[PDB]
């Protein structure tokens, strides 16, 4: 027949090739395939094409553009015009506009303040040729839901770039983030930290068990780790040693930790500590659960902690005797021999010799008996000629628990060796079987395997032989493309047959190999394969290093070797604090897997499968035998499926759909120099390598990292690893000390100063004082005899600070000739800069306590200037060049209400409450989204689609009269719910705003809650609730009341006519009620009389009330808010407070909402207060989206939708600004749309602050400003 | 706003009885029988809680 | 678990509408003696006599 095969990596990659490859054999080869890829909705084609031989495969390395959208379903549809045959096959494929991997690698592991934050970042395409391309946005987000930095709109040329940042010597401390964003939405971060802490000198390390098990006594625990220059310390060693989850409650001055021994020890002079243990007083069983440990050790006359979690998620296991598989034969079939491998090892993880099985197979009802190799090994085999399903199964015990499984309370299993082999479908009777290696891979190599064919009849009629044929595969890609035949014998079903194919590189780190065959009678077979190709680089690098050097040795260099025109990462790190705590995410493993895609496997959720219409379903099938016998469904292996697992995808009619029918439904020389950076730059290598001329650093002796990543277009990229270059000096005098003091308060300093090498000498260390501290010693007249091999004799010391900021400290020693005493002798010659005189640094406060000096005040040009001056001027016992004070300049909408606003975006299910609470939220934040000016026609249309259907699912639960219930229909005798239908004519006032409604809705509802009047009173809630919570009030009418006058007076565009004055008169009622009083929570209902009166306009009354409120202030350090009595009078209750929602979120928006609203404009002190309550409010929101309710949710998002709807307006984006201080100290700002928010942080000098603002343009903005200042002169 | 509400299920006389569950007429709904409005501080409406 | 082991001493299982009923009320707890005055909480319930 006419053959053709189509192999397409079945994900379509764009900005790279696109190589599928393809096959031609037996008849046409005037012929012209063509992969047609068209978006025929309007109308795309790119279209591919090629021409070949017969009985020869070969590839298009056609590519792709970006596209309408990001991800997309492709139907590729090949052509194949030959002269006499035509054809033609549709498919499903797809294509993602490329979204990279980029990344940061920050400098180092823990960062001291008044440092240029420096980093990086990359990005390439499939094809890791590297990719120079825009970028929309590279900056840091300050920990508190803000900004501090920022770098954008620019563009890789190096397909790289570098930064630096000067951070302060005073700023925040904690958590940190790099984070940047790809243009099409798609972002990410690298977290990092900047805290306090005080150096290492060295490192050590645990010696463990990551891995105890059941039967164990003890545990081959000891302590061995590192010095400078991997040398020996002195010092006392300790653990922390524990179990956990005992039966204490970890309550109630309880805790979870289980058992927890002690084993300190003295620090040998040779080697490593050594401390073992017993594990019985552990009891290793059913409830007490896996060990959690640290352990620390000092270094003497330095009295260090070093703190480490590690070793930790062990395998106190259950399943001993622990086997398992390595050669598989993945598939058994009847006319072939399969034989895999089986070795055997368990728990400790290392065979034993000579230990017995047992063999079993199923319908091949097997039965055998082994025993182990060196390591278990064995590759029996079995002969096959049995019903379609194989189960096997092998031991060297039996099947049970054996002691005590039927009692639940113990802590044991045993393995069972397990697998399964599905079998062809071949009506050809043909397939094939391999014999991998199935094992780890060498690269830069190559070696040979051979497999194992059969041939049917060989060639029934055909032509005489054959080729097979394989895809080397590559990350759902093509890497090479390659066959390989020889003669056949006429009829025959040989197996002999031989492959090495090449390991160099180009590929992803599958070997996810297939080769195949096929034939001209519609017939094809092959079979797939996976290895673990281990880490390779299209370009291996490394770096290297003449012969690490001493410590004023600052003669230094680099040694990589990479492609020859190429740039690259290059760092290089004092290692002393990232050998203190690690880095993240930084190797050859993880270039490969933070690419997204890793194995490009299996057709993803989208797409099922083609579907081919053969049904068999005759009405009896005649099935020759005994008894006839219907159709069935199996499940077998097939070579659909054999592709399906590679993943690539062909266009062809062999035999390869098995006859599955259709569902019937059933038939009727020292000078410090800075650490903190040793290298990060970028040296280019050139054809011979690169040669970058680092300079070692004096005056400080420690560890050293090489940080590393290449790139260049020739070669790909790739990974170098670990310089280490540990300093040393024959004579070193070390000063070390704590961190944490100030110029206020003493403390202490012990210098040792070191030998190591054969000589022992007579030697003082001493200081050289100065004015910014007071130094003098304890034991100075001490005449220190001499120091052996690591000698180190410390003498004690007192000392204060008084100079302030990056002050530094020296001591000094030298060997000293001609004191013959101690030693045997003491001539004293080290290198001519024999004496060390070492100064590190340091940074000190000044004395005492700085505390919170703040305020709030804000202003807003509305076609003209606003402007202020302020004092931040207190000094009541002031000390000294101490006081240190700012403020920060951006607007208020931007700062972290991305996740929340982005992430609330939500699909109906369920009862009218939720399904209101499902509805109506993605009101608000639609409004919130589209207020911002960040947002999208899409997420706009698909949310029409979510407002209808959720509306209409209201409409399931309402009333036949008008009203809203939970239930609604098939109860039709019912009433609806008060505050429920007081939201609902809310959110349909608000929805109606955005999109249409029809106005019989509020209509009937609104005036619903107009009869909801007899006489007078104040109503209640008809009590029909499934939630307390989702109301976030406390019941009282009064605030209930007080929610229909607001949710009533909003009136956003209709008309609240009769109802909602009387909930103003019931209001006012309830006022006189309450203010008569003085307590009805004290915050909550006169909040809610405040936002009343407000959007109601009752200005003397509403100001009354916030007024009081005003005086009722539970404010913020940073911000402003209100909380009920928190220690009710009633008693509470004990998992968040039941029968309470405590809706503070809810409440603190209704005291926020009451100073935004006058029908022009409030006074600019409800702006200040405004975005205090809201600081508050992001503050107070989580991960997900929303807050602790609906009802919260809702009126927050409002509350700020509306905030910014007074502050913000398309063409108004040109607020202006200055401040004028008199001492010639001012500054100028501006603040636009585009620069919406960029943080300025600011310091002053003046101790008092003077500085007059001035605000003009357009928008509103958010400065903060306060100050940090000493206190405490004496206090006697 | 008027409630019978204590915590149990509270008739007193011949009977254990939560509040009987009743369905008859009232003033308040022969107010409503017209067509008017009025106001009353009055006790024209039935005890239900 | 229980501690706090008041008792029920010289209880009435009745109660009426022309009477006082008063439960002396015994409290005691654990090695068997009560805290020399701590306050209580004796909730009257329909009467909320509390
Ligand atoms: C929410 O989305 C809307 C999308 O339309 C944003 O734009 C608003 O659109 C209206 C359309 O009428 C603008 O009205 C304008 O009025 C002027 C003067 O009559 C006229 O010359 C324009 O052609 C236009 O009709 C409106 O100014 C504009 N902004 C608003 C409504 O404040 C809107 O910015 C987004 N913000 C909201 C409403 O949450
Ligand atoms: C202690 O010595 C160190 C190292 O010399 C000082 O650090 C730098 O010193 C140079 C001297 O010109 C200054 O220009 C730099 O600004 C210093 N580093 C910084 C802060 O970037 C350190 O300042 C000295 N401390 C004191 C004040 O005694
Ligand atoms: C291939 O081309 C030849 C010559 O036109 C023709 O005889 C043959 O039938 C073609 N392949 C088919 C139709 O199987
Ligand atoms: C447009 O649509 C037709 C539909 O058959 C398709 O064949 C063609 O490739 C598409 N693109 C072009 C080239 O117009
Ligand atoms: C480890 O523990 C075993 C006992 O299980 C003990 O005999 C041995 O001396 C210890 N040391 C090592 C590393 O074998
Ligand atoms: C294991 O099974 C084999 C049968 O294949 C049997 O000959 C042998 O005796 C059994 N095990 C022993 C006891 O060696
Ligand atoms: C395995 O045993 C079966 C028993 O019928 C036999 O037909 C087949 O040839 C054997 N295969 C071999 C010898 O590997
Ligand atoms: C009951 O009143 C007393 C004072 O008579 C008071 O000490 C106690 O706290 C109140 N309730 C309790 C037991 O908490």
Redesign the interface.
């Known amino acids: 027949k006419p053959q053709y095969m189509v192999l397409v990596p079945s994900l379509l990659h764009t900005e790279t090739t696109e190589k599928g490859c393809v096959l031609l054999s037996y008849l046409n080869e005037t012929v012209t395939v063509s992969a047609s890829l068209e978006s025929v909705r309007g109308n795309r084609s790119l279209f591919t094409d090629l021409e070949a031989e017969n009985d020869v495969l070969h590839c298009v390395a056609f590519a792709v553009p970006k596209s309408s959208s990001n991800e997309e379903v492709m139907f590729l549809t090949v052509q194949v015009k030959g002269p006499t045959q035509e054809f033609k096959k549709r498919t499903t494929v797809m294509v993602k506009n490329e979204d990279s991997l980029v990344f940061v690698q920050t400098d180092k592991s823990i960062y001291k303040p008044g440092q240029t934050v420096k980093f990086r970042v990359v990005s390439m395409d499939e094809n890791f040729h590297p990719l120079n391309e825009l970028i929309p946005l590279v900056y840091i987000q300050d920990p508190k839901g803000n900004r501090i930095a920022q770098w954008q709109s620019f563009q890789l040329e190096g397909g790289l770039k570098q930064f630096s940042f000067p951070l302060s010597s005073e700023p925040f401390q904690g958590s940190y983030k790099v984070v940047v964003q790809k243009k099409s939405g798609g972002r990410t971060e690298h977290p990092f930290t900047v805290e306090e802490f005080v150096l290492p000198k060295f490192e050590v390390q645990v010696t463990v068990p990551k891995i105890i098990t059941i039967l164990e006594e003890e545990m081959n625990v000891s302590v061995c780790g590192l010095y400078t220059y991997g040398k020996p310390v002195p010092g006392h060693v300790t653990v922390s040693i524990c179990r956990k989850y005992s039966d204490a409650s970890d309550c109630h001055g309880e805790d979870s930790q289980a058992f927890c021994e002690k084993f300190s020890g003295q620090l040998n002079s040779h080697g490593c500590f050594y401390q073992q243990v017993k594990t019985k007083v552990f009891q290793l069983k059913r409830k007490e659960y896996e060990m959690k440990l640290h352990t620390e050790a000092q270094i003497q006359e330095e009295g260090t902690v070093v703190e480490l979690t590690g070793r930790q998620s062990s395998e106190i296991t259950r399943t001993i005797t622990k086997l398992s598989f390595v050669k598989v034969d993945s598939h058994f079939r009847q006319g072939i021999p399969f034989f895999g491998q089986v070795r055997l090892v368990d728990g400790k993880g290392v065979p034993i010799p000579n230990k017995v099985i047992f063999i079993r197979g199923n319908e091949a009802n097997y039965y055998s008996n082994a025993t182990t190799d060196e390591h278990g090994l064995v590759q029996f085999s079995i002969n096959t000629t049995n019903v379609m399903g194989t189960s096997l199964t092998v031991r060297v015990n039996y099947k049970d628990r054996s002691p005590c499984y039927g009692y639940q309370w113990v802590s044991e299993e045993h393995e069972e060796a397990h697998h399964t082999a599905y079998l062809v479908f071949s009506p050809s009777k043909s397939f094939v079987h391999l014999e991998p290696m199935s094992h780890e891979l060498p690269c830069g190599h190559t070696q040979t395997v051979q497999a194992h064919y059969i041939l049917n009849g060989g060639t029934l009629l055909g032509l005489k032989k054959l080729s097979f044929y394989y895809l080397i595969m590559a990350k759902g890609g093509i890497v090479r493309t390659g066959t390989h035949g020889l003669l056949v014998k006429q009829e025959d079903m040989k197996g002999h047959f031989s492959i090495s194919i090449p390991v160099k590189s180009d590929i992803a780190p599958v070997a996810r190999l297939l080769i195949y065959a096929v034939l001209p009678t519609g017939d094809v077979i092959g079979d797939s394969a996976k290895y673990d190709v281990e880490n390779c680089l299209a370009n291996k690098v490394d770096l290297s290093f003449s012969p690490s050097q001493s410590l004023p040795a600052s003669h230094a260099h680099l040694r990589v070797t990479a492609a020859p025109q190429s740039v690259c990462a290059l760092r290089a790190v004092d290692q002393s604090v990232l050998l203190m705590k690690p880095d993240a995410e930084l190797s050859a493993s993880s270039v490969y897997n933070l690419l997204p895609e890793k194995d490009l496997t299996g057709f993803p959720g989208p797409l099922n499968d083609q579907d081919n219409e053969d049904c068999i379903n005759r009405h009896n099938v005649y099935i020759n035998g005994i008894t006839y016998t219907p159709v069935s469904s199996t499940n077998e292996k097939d070579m659909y499926s054999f592709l399906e697992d590679m993943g690539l995808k062909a266009f062809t009619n062999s035999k390869i759909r098995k006859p599955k029918m259709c569902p019937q439904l059933q038939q009727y020389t020292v000078r410090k120099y800075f650490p903190e950076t040793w290298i990060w730059d970028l040296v280019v290598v050139n054809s011979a390598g690169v040669a970058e001329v680092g300079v070692t650093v004096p005056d400080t002796i420690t560890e050293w990292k090489a940080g590393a990543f290449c790139l260049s277009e020739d070669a790909g990229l790739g990974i170098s690893s670990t310089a280490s270059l540990r300093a040393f000096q024959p004579f070193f005098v070390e000063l070390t000390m704590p961190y944490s003091v100030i110029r206020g308060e003493a403390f202490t300093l012990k210098a040792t100063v070191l030998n190591y090498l054969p000589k022992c000498i007579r030697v003082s260390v001493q200081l050289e004082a100065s004015p910014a501290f007071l130094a003098v010693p304890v034991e100075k007249e001490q005449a220190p005899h001499c120091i052996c091999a690591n000698g180190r004799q410390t003498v004690s010391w007192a000392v204060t600070p008084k100079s302030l900021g990056n002050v530094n400290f020296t001591v000094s020693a030298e060997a000293l000739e001609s004191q013959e005493l101690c030693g045997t002798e003491v001539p004293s010659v080290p290198e001519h800069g024999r004496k060390d005189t070492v100064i590190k640094p340091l940074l000190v406060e000044p004395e005492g306590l700085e505390k919170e000096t703040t305020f709030n005040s804000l202003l807003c040009p509305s076609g003209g200037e606003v402007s202020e001056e302020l004092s931040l001027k207190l000094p009541p016992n002031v000390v000294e060049e101490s006081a240190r004070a700012s403020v920060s300049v951006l607007g208020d909408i931007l700062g972290s209400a991305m996740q929340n606003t982005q992430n609330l975006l939500q699909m109906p299910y369920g009862c009218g409450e939720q399904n209101m609470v499902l509805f109506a939220p993605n009101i608000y934040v639609l409004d919130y989204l589209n207020e911002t000016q960040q947002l999208t026609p899409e997420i706009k249309s698909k949310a029409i689609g979510y407002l209808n259907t959720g509306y209409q699912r209201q409409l399931n639960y309402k009333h036949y009269d008008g009203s809203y219930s939970t239930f609604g229909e098939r109860y039709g005798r019912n009433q609806g719910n008060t505050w429920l239908t007081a939201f609902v004519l809310k959110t349909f006032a608000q929805a109606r705003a955005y999109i249409f409604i029809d106005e019989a809705h509020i209509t009937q509802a609104l005036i619903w809650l107009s009869q909801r ?8 809630s008809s009590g029909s609730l499934l939630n307390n919570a989702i109301k976030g009030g406390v019941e009282d ?1 009064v605030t209930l009341s007080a929610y229909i006058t607001i949710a009533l007076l909003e009136i956003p565009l209709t008309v609240t006519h009769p109802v909602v004055r009387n909930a103003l008169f019931c209001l006012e009622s309830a006022w006189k009620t309450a203010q008569e009083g003085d307590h009805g929570s004290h915050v909550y209902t006169k909040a809610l009389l405040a936002y009343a009166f407000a959007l109601a306009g009752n200005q003397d009354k509403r100001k009354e009330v916030l007024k009081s409120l005003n005086e009722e202030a539970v404010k913020k350090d940073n911000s402003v808010h209100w909380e009920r009595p928190q220690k009710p009078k009633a008693p509470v209750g004990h998992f968040y407070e039941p029968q309470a929602p405590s809706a503070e979120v809810e409440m603190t928006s209704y005291v926020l909402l009451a100073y935004l609203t006058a029908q022009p404009a409030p006074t600019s002190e409800d702006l200040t207060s405004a975005t205090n309550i809201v600081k508050w409010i992001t503050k107070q929101q989580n991960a997900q989206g929303g807050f602790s309710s609906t009802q919260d949710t809702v009126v927050a998002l409002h509350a700020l939708s509306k905030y910014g709807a007074a502050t913000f307006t398309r063409t108004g984006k040109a607020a202006q600004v200055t401040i004028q201080s008199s001492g010639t100290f001012s500054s100028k700002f501006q603040v636009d749309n585009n620069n919406r928010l960029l943080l300025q942080q600011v310091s002053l000098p003046e101790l008092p602050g003077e500085y007059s603002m001035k605000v003009t343009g357009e928008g509103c903005v958010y400065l903060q400003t306060s100050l940090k200042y000493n206190i405490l002169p004496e206090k006697e």
């Open positions: 009047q007899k006489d007078n009173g104040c109503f209640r009418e």
